[model samples]
Target: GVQVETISPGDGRTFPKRGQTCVVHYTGMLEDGKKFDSSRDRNKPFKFMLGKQEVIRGWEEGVAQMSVGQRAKLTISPDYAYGATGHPGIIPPHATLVFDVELLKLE
Candidate 1:
């Protein structure tokens, strides 16, 4: 049931792979549409290394399918995110996360 949905498919042949860095603009939210984080508000796309340490499992998996300029929404279950022990103050325990992500760059 949990999966990534393409809101707007983008153009590009290459997607980010493991060890590559990905830059994305996103808004993280709870299922009820409450926002938890927003890179848009910060006016900066968030950058991280794919399949690397410290990022959520859902993120690495979902972002792997994105092409440069792709726009997608990820429905992430707790198992792929901050699970039984969620990110304090930001996410609740066993919460489902929804993310609107735009693939900006890969390098």
Candidate 2:
């Protein structure tokens, strides 16, 4: 299971539901703290439809716990991430993933 720690839970009670669009800034890393991907480095936030597009399972589950403007860290188990194959040379097989995510917008 993924562990969600909300740094700032954002405002209001309006959490995203299926089909709603969500925007977030995020950084993904290996359990050892090796950075893998970052939206901050690109100066852009990632946008995805809630419960719609086929993003990683961990992201879908983790982001659902956030509201707009919320910042959270998610510790995702291998079952919810890249799986046993992982990322080959980039990330090890069945490795846990860590993500620091900030919710930006919802539509």
Candidate 3:
């Protein structure tokens, strides 16, 4: 499971539901704080359908709890991330990932 800590809370009661499209800006890093990816760096928000497995399991679970304009820090265990195999050339085996994520939109 993903561990969630709020950085900044969003207003209103809206939360993304399964199958809805969600947009977010995120910076992904390893436990050592080495940055791996960032939507902000590309000046593009990451978009995916909720519960679609378009991303790691942690992302699907973590992002679903966010409301628009909410910022959060998600500490994802390897089991919920890439696991022992990890991503080639990016993440290492058994690495725990950290993501600073901001939910931007839901559609």
Best candidate, lDDT: 3
**lDDT, candidate 3, 1-107, per-residue tens:** 79989999986489998899998999999987699999999999988998777999999899888888999999999999999898999899999999999999888
Cα lDDT tens digits for candidate 1, 19-52: 9989889999998868889999998788899877
CA-lDDT, candidates in order: 0.87, 0.88, 0.92
RMSD of model 3, in Å?
0.9
Model 3 lDDT, residue 27, Cα: 96
Q: Write the per-residue lDDT of candidate 2 for residues 14-103, one digit (tens) a residue.
A: 789999889889998998868989999999888999887568899888888888788999999999988989877787888999999998
Q: After superposition, how far is residue 93 of candidate 2 from its true place, in Å?
A: 0.4
Best by TM-score: 3
| Stretches of model 2 off by over 4 angstroms after superposition | none
TM-score for all models, in order of appearance: 0.93, 0.92, 0.96
* Clash statistics: count for each candidate: 0, 0, 0
